[model samples]
Target: IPGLKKLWSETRGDPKICVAVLDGIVDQNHPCFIGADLTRLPGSMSTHGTHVASIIFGQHDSPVTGIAPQCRGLIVPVFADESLKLSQLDLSRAIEQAVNNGANIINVSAGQLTDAGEADTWLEKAIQLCQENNVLLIAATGNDGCECLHVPASLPTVLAVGAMDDQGKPVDFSNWGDAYQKQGILAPGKDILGAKPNGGTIRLSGTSFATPIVSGVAALLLSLQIKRGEKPDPQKVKNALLASATPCNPKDTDDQSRCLMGKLNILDAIEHLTGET
Candidate 1:
């Protein structure tokens, strides 16, 4: 917890950061999230949201501290039951609640390859509303390992994150696509060491981890802005992140659009914020 204290101190002890974990229901009874609330879900459910909570704010005893160890978060437990799938409408309502709760960033690590009917319309609208309200949205591109990027992630207003290896290369298991050129970014995700499902430790890799990394970075950026007595705007934050990203590797392929495989650099992003090289 000393490290957490130090990290919070660096951010000047501001607790206004609110990340919305838009995913499965995490186990509320888990030691990592004893004080967090999951009533956002319809009723009693398994602990998917619990695992995510552990990733963001669990203490030292937990398997791993998330990228934003002390950033307070809200859980929008939409996908609770294994059999009960989440519709686009459900996701929209959840995002609305997150904005209403004053979340500065929204982290969505769940998505389907195929559109589930009219649910997309609701999702698109929700993203627009978040944009209008200055809330940064982060999402996993997808886990199918296809060259095609996922929906809300492909949405212009959202920051789509892809997975990269320890070597700072694209993860072979990660999805990719040219359509992502306008909104995509990458982060360390291959065998990423992070909080686990059990009470102990493990290495889970996917765009899921990448999404949170970006979200945490966004939080850091917003915190810096607030420290300077400036209002945090999602669009400006999104632009700074994208502009700071190194150009996709030239040797990667012909589809220049799919080349955004470099891991995101927080230092570089901060430099961009300060107008430094």
Candidate 2:
């Protein structure tokens, strides 16, 4: 976080950067979101959804402040209930719905498990649409604790995320498979305090929790791009994030590959995006 802290003083977010969170039910009434630019799409109310959304959209003066609260937030509930019941086809539709509703970047902290990094055909097309429309999809690499894959996270053009602790080391449960080696990056996921469903806050840990952190960072970068009078270049922001990641070398860690590109370096990403030292 020194990188993120430095950029926080630059800009909070820009309204042009609409981030649609495709997840479970959300707690729109939560105090953390009061007066925030958030739109709740009809579907579900979920603790999971609330936690994820708050990471990026929680009001500045709230208990758990967000990373890009100034950016527009669209809550699209893909998971209908607590059972967490979800289908690849419906997930695909949810993604398209986000795009249709005018999303600049989308965050999904949900995924079905797979061993071979296989993605549903329909889901593949949905991700393709995001790439075509310049809408970046940021997703979680499920907490399988091994080298495995998640559908949207493994799909091409989607930015996969793995969990890292405050010390900048990869968490034990984060998944980092072959496809994610280049696309995925670590973020603050350990004991991350975020908004709970009712009103208070709780500490949660997982790659799912980590996904929103990256989404918030991406939103900030894109917001800055718009601040500079340029179109929201999500692709460029994605590239900058991956390119500017702090790489993990062989000497420091046990499983070097789990580092997956590396931990996020927000300042470095800004430089990568704007070519400023």
Candidate 3:
């Protein structure tokens, strides 16, 4: 696994670079969120949002520090129920809101399997808005233990993320296929430690957790670009992440499709941004 501490020591991120977490209700009072610029919206409650938010920009001394603690967080509560039932309208509104609020990176840790064959009109329009504004959209490939890609994640404009276990093997439950391989990446998601709503730490597993890790790294890359007097673009950030990804063990899995772009290496991404690799 890549060390986030090393990445932080190199660059904590720029306040100007905002990252949005579009998920379920987040606990604004959570200990990991103290002093962080986290703005919540009205929505149904769930512990999943807090965990995802903490992974992106948790407080420095919190039990679980985030990947880019200095970046401002724009949290959009989109899930309408505890079961995490989200409609396309809910997601479109969240994405539009995040872009309007100046989010340079948008993390969608939730997705639904749709047979619509193409993205919904609302979703497509929202994604187009992000592209127009140069905001990177990262989403989780569904948790279904099959090769079927899930929407939003399966969409071409969104960066899809799959799960990797602690041993660097692709998780059995992560969705993967040729479609996912075209735009997806992998990150550590098994038993991942993150903050709960009550300030306690909990270990959760899913592609949801993996999505924010890439979003945080994207923030870091944007910060580095700013430091270099260069403007950060979403496609460039996505390219850097893909270019710096670490290959998973071939012996660990017989399914090549599940490996996708291997696993995300935040430190390697930073190195690539700084031209150290």
When sorted by TM-score, best at the front, the candidate numbers are 2, 3, 1
TM-scores of all candidate predictions against the true structure: 0.83, 0.96, 0.94
Using lDDT as the measure, which candidate wins? 2
Candidate 3, residue 110: Cα displacement in angstroms equals 0.5
TM-score of 2: 0.96
lDDT of 2 at 122: 93
Per-candidate clashes come to 8, 3, 0
Q: Write the per-residue lDDT of candidate 3 for residues 13-111, one digit (tens) a residue.
A: 889999989987787778888778877654345689888988888878887778888888887888754688678887999999999999999999988
Residue runs of model 1 more than 4 Å from their true location after superposition? 1-9, 29-48, 60-62, 81-85, 115-119, 248-257, 275-277
Which segments of candidate 2 are over 4 A away from where they belong?
250-252
Residue 185 in model 3: shift from native, Å?
0.9
Top candidate by TM-score: 2
Clashes of 3: 0
Score each candidate by Cα lDDT.
Answer: 0.67, 0.87, 0.83
RMSD per prediction, one decimal? 4.1, 1.4, 1.8
Show the colliding residue pairs in model 1: 25-48, 25-49, 26-47, 26-48, 26-49, 26-50, 27-47, 147-176
Task: Give lDDT tens digits, candidate 1, residues 58-121.
Answer: 5445455555655667778777565535577888898989988888899887665664212378
